[PDB]
């Protein structure tokens, strides 16, 4: 009837998306790379570390001023810390002790937790009785909250394990947008610097780029082979990265639609828990299962340093706004900081 | 030194949080945390009654012992993404019906609902994350069992059944083949009760099981076991 | 809302002893230092005692060591200052300022009433201010100077001068508490600048609602020292 024919449309048409993917590569990134000079010898000495957390540490995001740092852990206890010297600013009990993501707005006022009690709650940093409150519950989601991402003082994205990602208008409590089109359970989230897009990785081993206002997917990246578990975009905004349980690390090309560079070693057979940039783009920073990080040439290809020093798995990463340090949160319920 | 005065005031403000931080320790630490588990509908109901979203949890004291259940009810997703998250348990409670072996799932056929319960239990006792968690084994509706084996034999379920078709030696039969799936027998035990009880006898059963637990981990970390 | 109803004044013979106490409502006062500011006659703020959350630090001044006891109480949200052997400099208007330290803290932002107490008839850094009176026509701008002896400019990056705005039968208000960041609820008309040992305080648009009295204070070390205080007139 109609299903067999529209089922040979899509697969006629993912034909021709495949044909005009093909027909537009012309000289692979390494090709082009090869005639630069190498990045050398990435050597990070450990500078601070942050201790106080009772458990697995599973989030952790950076302040805009590149000092303030935010964690979550299983204790059910958001800490806020001051990097430069160690010490804690505020200590936020949670409602729910399994959390599994946390968010720093980027005027500094506010704080988001969300996990496995389906609710992104909303915490009230600069309070005129000096505690900190639960400013506002989000909820809506039928699944477990994997990550959230501040847009301003009044939006923020939410993405669920349900198939699904949001965008809430804090104020009134409501859902001003759903996103949809995964086949599986989000896991990351990373948003465009300019505030326009922002992109998410599922289950599905694909992701997918959207858009805040329209709520429509423009582009869908496929290449891995597992669960993608963490995404992050270039700084200028015309690429991201992202990580997979199949031990490899992808570069994928919003203008050019199509995957750029795979960063792999025969030597990791482990998953990756988190992605991040440095500030140039020249270096990829992603952590592993086996409780390391590698820092990756992210033109080359070619592992330039490793970050060791964490006795569990690599849960989270960080780089500053500045680009002064990296943040490595891990199981071992210790933060650091590293140069 | 080197400090301003507001440097050691904030100093001195972290020094209380951490006090906090750490006493908040002590008692997250002294709470028996069990995660129940259960195929559909079989005890699901009834545990949580002898105590007369997302994640669902029940805080009760018995004989000066705090107790933490987690129900993962209506979570449904992917499990290999949120299990990990219980790798610290005391105890897993599992709750398995007797009176399932003559239904169907009614949505698979060749899928009998003891087994689905089976593959469940063999999927969480060897999950890599609770290798060394124990298993407290529930087996509800014994009663039903009780009127319903003298109409329908055992051997619905499981064709190598050889035995007589009366309720002792079926249970046994039951437990058996349920305990048969650990295969960490060296590392971790399985308590099985029948609590197709009307008095509180369940609640005793999981405060020796918790006890026998916790005295197995005093051994360990001591080195004597 | 948060407020800090003094209680114990009154008039006392030399040689006795009050006890005052400010009640608090509508914070959590176990979070937040406590500080006691008196004020005699001759308009001019005083520094008095301080008490630290906890209860782990306390400070003094140098005038009222062995005389005076700073206490608080956690459970009842009431904070106490015993007074003995008083003298007749003692007679003030004994404020309960409240602070809290952290990270981009802003301390020292909300003052109590007040209360009245009167009794019958060296490394220390000096806070200067030149202009004691500045008469100006409202809609112009006024600029307030407030010199130091010792560079306030901490190893850190912090400068710790504050400033403060005492209405005409009123309680003393923040204005600006690290000499450029502005307080919560004050318009952004109040500029504040400075370097080293020369601060200054710009008002923009003047209004008769910032007719009063301004002070600057400073916090790299104890005891905190105050100004003696610019008068904007007309």
């Known amino acids: 009837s109609e299903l067999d024919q529209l089922r040979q449309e899509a697969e006629q048409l993912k034909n021709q998306i495949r044909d005009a993917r093909k027909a537009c590569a012309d000289a692979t990134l390494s090709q082009i790379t090869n005639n630069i000079d190498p990045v050398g010898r990435i050597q990070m000495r450990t500078r601070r570390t942050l201790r106080g957390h009772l458990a697995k540490i599973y989030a952790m995001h950076w302040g805009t001023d590149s000092r303030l740092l935010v964690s979550a852990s299983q204790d059910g206890k958001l800490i806020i810390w001051d990097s430069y010297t160690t010490n804690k600013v505020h200590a936020i009990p949670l409602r729910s002790s399994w959390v599994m993501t946390c968010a720093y707005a980027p005027s500094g006022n506010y704080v988001a937790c969300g996990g496995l009690d389906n609710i992104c709650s909303i915490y009230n940093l600069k309070t005129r009785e000096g505690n900190v409150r639960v400013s506002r519950e989000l909820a809506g989601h039928t699944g477990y909250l994997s990550c959230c991402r501040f847009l301003d003082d009044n939006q923020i994205v939410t993405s669920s394990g349900d198939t699904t990602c949001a965008l809430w208008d804090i104020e009134t409590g409501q859902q001003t947008t759903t996103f949809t089109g995964h086949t599986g359970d989000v896991m990351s989230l990373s948003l465009a610097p300019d505030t326009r897009l922002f992109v998410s990785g599922a289950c599905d081993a694909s992701a997918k780029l959207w858009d805040v206002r329209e709520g429509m997917c423009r582009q869908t990246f496929t290449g891995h082979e597992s669960d993608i578990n963490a995404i992050c975009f270039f700084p200028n905004g015309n690429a991201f990265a992202t990580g997979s349980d199949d031990a490899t690390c992808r570069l994928f090309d919003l203008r050019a639609d199509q995957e750029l560079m795979t960063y792999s070693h025969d030597n990791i057979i482990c998953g990756i828990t988190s992605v991040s940039f440095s500030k140039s783009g020249r270096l990829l920073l992603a952590g592993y299962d086996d409780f390391n990080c590698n820092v990756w040439d992210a033109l080359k290809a070619d592992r330039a340093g490793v970050l060791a020093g964490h006795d569990n798995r690599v849960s989270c990463l960080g780089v500053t706004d500045d680009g002064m340090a990296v943040a490595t949160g891990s199981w071992d319920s210790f933060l650091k900081i590293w140069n | 030194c080197t400090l301003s005065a507001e440097d050691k005031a904030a100093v001195e403000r972290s020094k209380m949080i951490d006090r906090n931080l750490r006493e908040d320790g002590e008692k997250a630490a002294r709470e028996v945390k069990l995660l129940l588990l259960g195929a559909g509908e079989s005890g699901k109901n009834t545990i949580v009654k002898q105590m007369k979203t997302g994640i669902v949890e029940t805080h009760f004291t018995f004989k000066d012992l705090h107790f933490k259940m987690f129900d993962v009810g209506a979570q449904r997703s992917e499990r290999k993404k949120w299990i990990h998250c219980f790798e610290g348990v005391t105890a897993i409670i599992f709750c398995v019906a007797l009176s399932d072996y003559d239904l169907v799932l009614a949505e698979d056929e060749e899928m009998n609902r003891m087994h689905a319960s089976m593959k469940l239990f063999d999927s969480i006792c060897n999950n890599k994350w609770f290798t060394d968690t124990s298993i407290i084994l529930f087996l509800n509706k014994k009663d039903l069992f009780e009127e319903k084996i003298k109409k329908s034999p055992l051997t619905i379920c499981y064709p190598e059944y050889a035995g007589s078709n009366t309720y002792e030696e079926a249970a046994a039969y039951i437990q058996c083949q349920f305990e048969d799936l650990n295969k960490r027998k060296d590392t971790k035990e399985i308590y099985t009760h029948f609590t197709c009880s009307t008095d509180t006898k369940n609640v005793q059963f999981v405060f020796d099981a918790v006890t026998d637990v916790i005295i197995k981990n005093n051994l360990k970390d001591c080195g004597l076991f | 809302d948060v407020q800090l109803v003094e209680s114990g004044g009154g008039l006392v013979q030399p040689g006795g002893s009050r006890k005052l106490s400010c009640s608090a409502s509508?914070?959590?006062?176990?979070?937040?230092?406590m500080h006691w500011v008196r004020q005699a006659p001759e308009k001019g703020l005083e520094w008095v005692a301080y008490?630290?959350?906890?209860?782990?630090?306390?400070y003094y001044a140098d005038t009222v060591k062995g005389r005076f006891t700073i206490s608080r109480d956690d459970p009842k949200n009431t904070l106490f200052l015993q007074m003995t052997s008083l003298r007749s400099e003692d007679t003030a208007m004994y404020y309960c300022?409240?602070?809290?330290?952290?990270?981009?803290?802003?301390?020292?932002?909300?003052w109590g009433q007040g209360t009245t107490l009167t009794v019958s008839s060296g490394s220390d850094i000096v806070m200067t201010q030149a202009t004691s009176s500045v008469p100006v026509t409202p809609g112009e701008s006024v600029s307030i100077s407030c010199r130091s002896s010792?560079?306030?400019?901490?190893?850190?990056?912090?400068?710790?001068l504050y400033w403060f705005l005492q209405r005409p039968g009123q309680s003393p208000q923040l204005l600006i508490y690290?000499?450029?960041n502005l307080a919560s609820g004050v318009p952004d008309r109040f500029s504040g600048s400075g370097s080293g040992t020369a601060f200054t305080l710009t008002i923009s648009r003047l209004e008769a609602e910032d007719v009063g009295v301004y002070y600057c204070?400073?916090?790299?070390?104890?005891?905190?020292?105050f100004g003696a205080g610019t008068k904007l007139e007309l």
């Open positions: 008490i630290s959350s906890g209860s782990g630090t306390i």
């Open positions: 204070m400073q916090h790299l070390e104890y005891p905190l020292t």
């Open positions: 010792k560079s306030l400019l901490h190893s850190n990056g912090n400068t710790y």
């Open positions: 509508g914070f959590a006062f176990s979070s937040f230092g």
């Open positions: 300022v409240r602070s809290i330290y952290y990270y981009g803290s802003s301390p020292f932002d909300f």
């Open positions: 690290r000499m450029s």
